[PDB]
Amino acid sequence: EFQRVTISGEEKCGVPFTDLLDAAKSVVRALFIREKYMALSLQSFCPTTRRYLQQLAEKPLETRTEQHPYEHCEPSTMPGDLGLGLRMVRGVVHVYTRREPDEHCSEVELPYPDLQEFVADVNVLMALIINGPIKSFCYRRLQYLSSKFQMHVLLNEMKELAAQKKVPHRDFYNIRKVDTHIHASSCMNQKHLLRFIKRAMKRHLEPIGESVLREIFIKTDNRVSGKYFAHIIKEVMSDLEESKYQNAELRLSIYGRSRDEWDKLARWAVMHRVHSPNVRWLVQVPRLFDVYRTKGQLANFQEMLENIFLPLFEATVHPASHPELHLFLEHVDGFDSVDDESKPENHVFNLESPLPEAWVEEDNPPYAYYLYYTFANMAMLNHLRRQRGFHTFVLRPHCGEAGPIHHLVSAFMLAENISHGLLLRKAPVLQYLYYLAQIGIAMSPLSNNSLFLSYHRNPLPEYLSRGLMVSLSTDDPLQFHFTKEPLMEEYSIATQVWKLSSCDMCELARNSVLMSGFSHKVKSHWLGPNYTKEGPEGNDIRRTNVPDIRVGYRYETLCQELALITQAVQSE
Amino acid sequence: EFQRVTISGEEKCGVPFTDLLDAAKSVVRALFIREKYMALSLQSFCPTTRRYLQQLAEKPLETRTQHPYEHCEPSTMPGDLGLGLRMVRGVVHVYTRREPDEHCSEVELPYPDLQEFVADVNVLMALIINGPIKSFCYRRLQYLSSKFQMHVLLNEMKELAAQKKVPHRDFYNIRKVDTHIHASSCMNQKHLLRFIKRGESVLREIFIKTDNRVSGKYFAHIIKEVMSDLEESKYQNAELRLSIYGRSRDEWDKLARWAVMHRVHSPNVRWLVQVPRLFDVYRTKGQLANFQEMLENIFLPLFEATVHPASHPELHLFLEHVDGFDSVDDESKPENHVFNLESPLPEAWVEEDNPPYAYYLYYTFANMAMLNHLRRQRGFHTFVLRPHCGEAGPIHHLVSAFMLAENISHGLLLRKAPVLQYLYYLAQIGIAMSPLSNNSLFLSYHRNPLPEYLSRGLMVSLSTDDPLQFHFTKEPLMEEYSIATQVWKLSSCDMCELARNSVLMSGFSHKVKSHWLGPNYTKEGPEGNDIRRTNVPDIRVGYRYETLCQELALITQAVQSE
Amino acid sequence: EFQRVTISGEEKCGVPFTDLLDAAKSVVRALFIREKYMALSLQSFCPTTRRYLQQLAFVADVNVLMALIINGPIKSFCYRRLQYLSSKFQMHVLLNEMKELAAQKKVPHRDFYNIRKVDTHIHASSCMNQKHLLFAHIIKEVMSDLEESKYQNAELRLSHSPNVRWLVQVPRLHVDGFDSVDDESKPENHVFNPPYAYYLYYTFANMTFVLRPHCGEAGPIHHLVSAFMLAENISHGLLLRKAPVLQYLYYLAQIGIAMSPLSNNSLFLSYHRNPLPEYLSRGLMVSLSTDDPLQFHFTKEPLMEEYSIATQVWKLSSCDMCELARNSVLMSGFSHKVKSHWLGPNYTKEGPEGNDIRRTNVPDIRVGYRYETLCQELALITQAVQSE
Numbered sequence A: 001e002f003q004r005v006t007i008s009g010e011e012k013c014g015v016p017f018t019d020l021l022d023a024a025k026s027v028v029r030a031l032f033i034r035e036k037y038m039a040l041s042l043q044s045f046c047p048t049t050r051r052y053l054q055q056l057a058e059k060p061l062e063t064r065t066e067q068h069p070y071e072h073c074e075p076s077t078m079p080g081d082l083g084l085g086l087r088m089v090r091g092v093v094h095v096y097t098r099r100e101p102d103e104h105c106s107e108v109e110l111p112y113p114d115l116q117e118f119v120a121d122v123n124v125l126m127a128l129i130i131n132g133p134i135k136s137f138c139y140r141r142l143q144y145l146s147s148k149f150q151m152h153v154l155l156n157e158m159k160e161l162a163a164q165k166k167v168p169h170r171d172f173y174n175i176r177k178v179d180t181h182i183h184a185s186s187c188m189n190q191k192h193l194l195r196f197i198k199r200a201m202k203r204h205l206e207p208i209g210e211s212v213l214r215e216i217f218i219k220t221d222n223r224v225s226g227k228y229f230a231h232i233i234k235e236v237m238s239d240l241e242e243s244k245y246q247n248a249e250l251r252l253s254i255y256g257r258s259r260d261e262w263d264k265l266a267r268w269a270v271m272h273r274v275h276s277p278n279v280r281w282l283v284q285v286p287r288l289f290d291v292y293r294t295k296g297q298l299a300n301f302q303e304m305l306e307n308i309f310l311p312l313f314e315a316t317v318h319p320a321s322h323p324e325l326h327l328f329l330e331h332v333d334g335f336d337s338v339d340d341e342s343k344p345e346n347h348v349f350n351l352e353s354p355l356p357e358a359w360v361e362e363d364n365p366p367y368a369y370y371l372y373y374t375f376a377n378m379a380m381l382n383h384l385r386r387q388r389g390f391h392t393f394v395l396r397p398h399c400g401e402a403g404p405i406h407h408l409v410s411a412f413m414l415a416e417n418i419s420h421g422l423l424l425r426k427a428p429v430l431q432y433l434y435y436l437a438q439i440g441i442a443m444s445p446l447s448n449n450s451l452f453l454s455y456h457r458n459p460l461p462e463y464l465s466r467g468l469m470v471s472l473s474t475d476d477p478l479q480f481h482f483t484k485e486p487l488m489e490e491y492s493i494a495t496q497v498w499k500l501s502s503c504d505m506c507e508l509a510r511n512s513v514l515m516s517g518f519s520h521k522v523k524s525h526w527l528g529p530n531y532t533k534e535g536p537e538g539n540d541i542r543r544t545n546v547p548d549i550r551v552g553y554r555y556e557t558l559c560q561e562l563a564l565i566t567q568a569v570q571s572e
Numbered sequence B: 001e002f003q004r005v006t007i008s009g010e011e012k013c014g015v016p017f018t019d020l021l022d023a024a025k026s027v028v029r030a031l032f033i034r035e036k037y038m039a040l041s042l043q044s045f046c047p048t049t050r051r052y053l054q055q056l057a058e059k060p061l062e063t064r065t066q067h068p069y070e071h072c073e074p075s076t077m078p079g080d081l082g083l084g085l086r087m088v089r090g091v092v093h094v095y096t097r098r099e100p101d102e103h104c105s106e107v108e109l110p111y112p113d114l115q116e117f118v119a120d121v122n123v124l125m126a127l128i129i130n131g132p133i134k135s136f137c138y139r140r141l142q143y144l145s146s147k148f149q150m151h152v153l154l155n156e157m158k159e160l161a162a163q164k165k166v167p168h169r170d171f172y173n174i175r176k177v178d179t180h181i182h183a184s185s186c187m188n189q190k191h192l193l194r195f196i197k198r199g200e201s202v203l204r205e206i207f208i209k210t211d212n213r214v215s216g217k218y219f220a221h222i223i224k225e226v227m228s229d230l231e232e233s234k235y236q237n238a239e240l241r242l243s244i245y246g247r248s249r250d251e252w253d254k255l256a257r258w259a260v261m262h263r264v265h266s267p268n269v270r271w272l273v274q275v276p277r278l279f280d281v282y283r284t285k286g287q288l289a290n291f292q293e294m295l296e297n298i299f300l301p302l303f304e305a306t307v308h309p310a311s312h313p314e315l316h317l318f319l320e321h322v323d324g325f326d327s328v329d330d331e332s333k334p335e336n337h338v339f340n341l342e343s344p345l346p347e348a349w350v351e352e353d354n355p356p357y358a359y360y361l362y363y364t365f366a367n368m369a370m371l372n373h374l375r376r377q378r379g380f381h382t383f384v385l386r387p388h389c390g391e392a393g394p395i396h397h398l399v400s401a402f403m404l405a406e407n408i409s410h411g412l413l414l415r416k417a418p419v420l421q422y423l424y425y426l427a428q429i430g431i432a433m434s435p436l437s438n439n440s441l442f443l444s445y446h447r448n449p450l451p452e453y454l455s456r457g458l459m460v461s462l463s464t465d466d467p468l469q470f471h472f473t474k475e476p477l478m479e480e481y482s483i484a485t486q487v488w489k490l491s492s493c494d495m496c497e498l499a500r501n502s503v504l505m506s507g508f509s510h511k512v513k514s515h516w517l518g519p520n521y522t523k524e525g526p527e528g529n530d531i532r533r534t535n536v537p538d539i540r541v542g543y544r545y546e547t548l549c550q551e552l553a554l555i556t557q558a559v560q561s562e
Numbered sequence C: 001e002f003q004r005v006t007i008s009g010e011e012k013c014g015v016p017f018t019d020l021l022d023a024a025k026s027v028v029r030a031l032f033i034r035e036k037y038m039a040l041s042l043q044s045f046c047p048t049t050r051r052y053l054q055q056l057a058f059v060a061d062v063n064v065l066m067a068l069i070i071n072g073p074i075k076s077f078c079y080r081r082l083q084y085l086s087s088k089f090q091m092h093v094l095l096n097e098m099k100e101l102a103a104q105k106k107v108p109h110r111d112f113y114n115i116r117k118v119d120t121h122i123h124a125s126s127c128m129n130q131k132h133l134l135f136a137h138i139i140k141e142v143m144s145d146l147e148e149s150k151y152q153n154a155e156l157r158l159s160h161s162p163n164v165r166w167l168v169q170v171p172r173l174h175v176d177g178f179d180s181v182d183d184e185s186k187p188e189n190h191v192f193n194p195p196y197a198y199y200l201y202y203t204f205a206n207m208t209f210v211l212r213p214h215c216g217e218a219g220p221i222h223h224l225v226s227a228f229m230l231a232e233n234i235s236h237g238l239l240l241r242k243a244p245v246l247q248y249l250y251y252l253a254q255i256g257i258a259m260s261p262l263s264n265n266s267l268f269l270s271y272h273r274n275p276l277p278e279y280l281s282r283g284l285m286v287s288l289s290t291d292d293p294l295q296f297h298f299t300k301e302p303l304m305e306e307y308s309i310a311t312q313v314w315k316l317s318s319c320d321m322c323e324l325a326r327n328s329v330l331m332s333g334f335s336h337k338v339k340s341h342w343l344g345p346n347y348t349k350e351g352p353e354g355n356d357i358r359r360t361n362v363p364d365i366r367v368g369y370r371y372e373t374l375c376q377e378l379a380l381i382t383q384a385v386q387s388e
């Protein structure tokens, strides 16, 4: 056991009940909104939050959802055509019983999202983030969480390190560590890339921006590009494989400028044999519609929404139509949004906004606009893929690095995990929810120092202390890092600058695996057979190096805070 | 050229001329004190500082200007001159002969005088306590900070453009030296813990109480592995610290054989020897009778090898890669005794107390100075004194180094000693800082004064105190740069300037340094910098040289005006 | 004479000429976009800025300025020159502080108590004790107390004492002007309750009266864009720190900012992070004010307490305080006759000629650096445009 800080008294929250209830009711409703949209997308919701939410809920809610894998490219073995019709209506993609005019087509009763409902939930949340009385309560409870952590370490730090001293075999250098936010394109040496680019131009005759790279993937066979990018990632795969305990979640780019992009990418993975047991792919949709339309490359935003989400629906129905994409999507776990979040937004995503088929102006759709139609199409794709026993997907957007705070309202509803999250520090309401919902925030403090928020100002220490599921990642593994082990270098600067214990380090590593897209089987090996179990019963120091004392503190603190909110709503 | 920040009027010092004159006279006096003990020690003194000093002096200044361990044949080594050696009042005296001769005359080496040293110490000890001078020094240190801010705000882009006109050089293609790394810290705790096959104290005894056959073969591989890891890097070199404790006279001969047997030699590794200041522990066990025994076990083998190469065969070879001495111990430990003429001498120090830091440093300096004089005449390689100074404890520890030390490590207490920092700048004394290690133990990372020392123009360099500890990666010098480059948000000029400082603060040969930084690296100012090898634009070197010369001139002109 | 920091070489602005003029064009334009609006509204424009602007001789202008504040490459020129102003002041104080203090002592007749000060942002409703509440009586003693203080004056707001002058206020949800007073943290969802940019547009040109608004406290950063076009002096100003371009224009236009560091700590900022010291160092016209004379203040000399807390926290010198006091009178809504006595007959002269240390306690060295610094900066912005 450990010294337990018990707040005995009447105003155990520190506010009058008349003020606890107002914030509690709004918080419960906000948590319900996330639960609804996570179920619709077959995405995850915090079991501890649900177990407490099932007491005020009027509707039941629960969790109901070797050979080189790419070597065997036999469309014959794959599941066959279902003859389903794929058409996009008002942004979302609808699935139909028949694929041809020859036979009658009936819409498959999938839970197609309602935009009016979304524009109502958003407006409820967007009013909770500006309520002074509630924003004050959340700030106070956030400050209490940090104080509770400080007393815990003061009164139990040595008990933790004694447990770590026992079980000597496990140390931060042999615990599982997942890089939860690394861009694959940034794994290239700018100097070496220009060398390859320079020679290739002469090959066609026989610094380099991300825009020049996009066009090559969209306007080239990728025969030369797919080899240079294959060796580099494969070397990263091999280097990450020698370091048995370091794994990466690389980000690949699907731009939505053509419908052959998904097929072009699955060939590169299969042709060049780009698979690792440690590398898991998440696909990023660069929010560059403004540039495409102004070039006359896309007529509607719906064309982009189609060129991204239709090649996925087609392979879920007739795997042999896209043989490679069927095998490449078993190692793809979700989608991501990428762009300069600093850029201003002149348009609000409401019911009075153009639909993807009507958005023909050169303006760029708002951030919520990209996020809602990624969530809707993904949710239907997951519902369809689950029935066929395929791979469910998740939405993990770049949310919070800069720009408006309202971006975090969009991700609170539609996103399982976020990246960065630097602007939650300015939103007491949102941070309280992100904690009570145990939403994963994969932070890259080093990249933030050189572009946005200084390392001194970075809120990672405060999120980690208060209980938010934070993890450390290398945004660009070669630009903001000088070592050849960038993930470790990230754990070093943060460990030293904020002076973090081994328990603090290992907690981040554990948080790096619980928010990753890895199999239950590999996670069972990584974190133990009972990693799914919530609380101390899911922690094995022999595999995590994290004392059950800390896991008890986090679990107990979250349970107590949830109880405060729920019990208040039960006493009105 | 670059934007030049210039001052107009008469009160360019910002204070009354009386304050400048009072400070300048004492500053010049302090600078002469260092110049004296550097020349006596055959060590280095800043050329630009000396040039200004010569114009205020009535005498000329004394400072001016395959595998090695493969075959050990004493018959090829230099001859024995038959000189006799004895330690008198701490220092070792060389005599015309050891056997009955016409006259065993003392060899006229410039033996130190303790009374002069104590007088010089007490002058500085009062200078670092004078409020008027402290205020003047504090303002000028602030001025150096503001001047640097103007330079970057006005010439950062000019500098960055120059670094781009030579793309062949970047931070990874420039030579860098780890100027303060301890060799014993290059070993894995777990691997060495199980190496017993069943902490510094145990390791000390495994070098003194045993042949060091299993120990040397094991410690040799772990260090020779680091040698190849650096040779592959090509551009990363280290100055590793080995321990000669002084408990036996066989230590020096032991260490040389370990290097010549296991061939622990690399072109990127230069050896420095650290004498841990643990006399009290040794005396309380009965292993040393008087402190003079410790000074004898450290310097007599070196003197004997200098006179009689064949007497110590491996040492004559191991000493061409040993560059100097170091002093190591918890500098937080309180000091009860002052080093005055009323203090016991090495031969009289029979008590169990630990001699003060200056006591250790003065006798290390004195014996080293005579050794360098003798080795210089023999043509052998001279040594240097590079103590651990300033990490913690009293500020007076930095007065000792200002007089007797060519370089210092750490140096974190200059932040509370305005006069000393001003003197270290005008004297351009190396300060091998390890911000990462400092964060864990003593001073927080953001409060480490490395940004201020570097901005104001002190010869600062970055190093890894413990390579395998405090560093999570396997390129610990680079990780040290990364945290410093990012936490303090530094530029390429800042990074590449620290790299050049690391090399100009090392003991590497002129030949290798010429290959690294250019044939004319010996020249002072911009003329000694080629951007094709350093990646530091001549804009930055020009600002540094101009600022130093101008600051030296302000001090010099004030004294001349009287 | 005083020691002077002289830059010599090429990129004395710190950027190549291409980036200098790319931002001098837009800065020169925005400065014109204010003179005309000050010319029509009967408001005041800076003499020195107008002198250089002459040699270069609504929603549309708003869009131009709104584009400029976001122009990133331009926002890097302003920041570099803003920091140069902070650095030049640090060198100036280091090499001239000793003489400036001696000059301030050379005329013992004037001290921080003998100089004239103006509370440029106090609220009349806040002069009354709420316990006492549970009108003219309170203001009568405030006027009497100010009258008892020979060298202390103020400007109150209503939603004749010679030391008190009125500036009416109008919530956005003898007399000399108007102010728009409302919680500026209230988010704006419509682009022009009537948005902030709305009230100022109609309050702008009605004028004589001058529009001195409550702008920059919090909320949108664009409020300062409206004030840079439709304001003479502003209160708070805590958001110019977030906008490098606006501050570079507020400095070059010598716009008056009435700051209340004591009150900002209670709600909208922290005393450590308050940008008052940085503004004063760079040369922006900053004055010290008490938003509430009794809520935040514990003494019976609140403006003195306001000046004291700033002086001690940021370690300000005698020149700093006296420089702030003169800035209070100069931006005050009083007459040439009033300032012929409080500041002197030559207070209209810009720069050293307009300074009488026997009446301001500010040495000519500080006035020389302030004026010289501004003239060179405008010359850089203007002479670059002239030779395009």
Ligand SMILES: CC1(C)CN(C(N)=O)c2ccccc2N1Cc1ccccc1
Residues within 6 Å of the ligand: A185, A213, A214, A216, A217, A222, A224, A225, A226, A228, A229, A251, A252, A253, A254, A265, A268
């Ligand atoms: C855009 C990117 C860089 C990365 N990428 C995806 N899908 O993001 C990709 C995938 C397969 C082939 C090429 C690429 N390229 C194009 C390219 C690669 C190598 C050299 C030049 C250009």
Ligand SMILES: CC1(C)CN(C(N)=O)c2ccccc2N1Cc1ccccc1
Residues within 6 Å of the ligand: B184, B192, B202, B203, B204, B206, B207, B212, B214, B215, B216, B218, B219, B241, B242, B243, B244, B255, B258
């Ligand atoms: C003290 C040290 C660690 C390092 N050292 C010097 N001179 O500093 C040394 C040199 C030659 C042989 C042994 C050592 N050892 C002893 C040792 C080596 C290997 C394993 C255990 C103990």
Ligand SMILES: [Zn+2]
Residues within 6 Å of the ligand: A181, A183, A398, A475
């Ligand atoms: Zn990213």
Ligand SMILES: [Zn+2]
Residues within 6 Å of the ligand: B180, B182, B388, B465
């Ligand atoms: Zn050390």
Ligand SMILES: [Zn+2]
Residues within 6 Å of the ligand: C121, C123, C181, C214, C235, C291
């Ligand atoms: Zn007000």
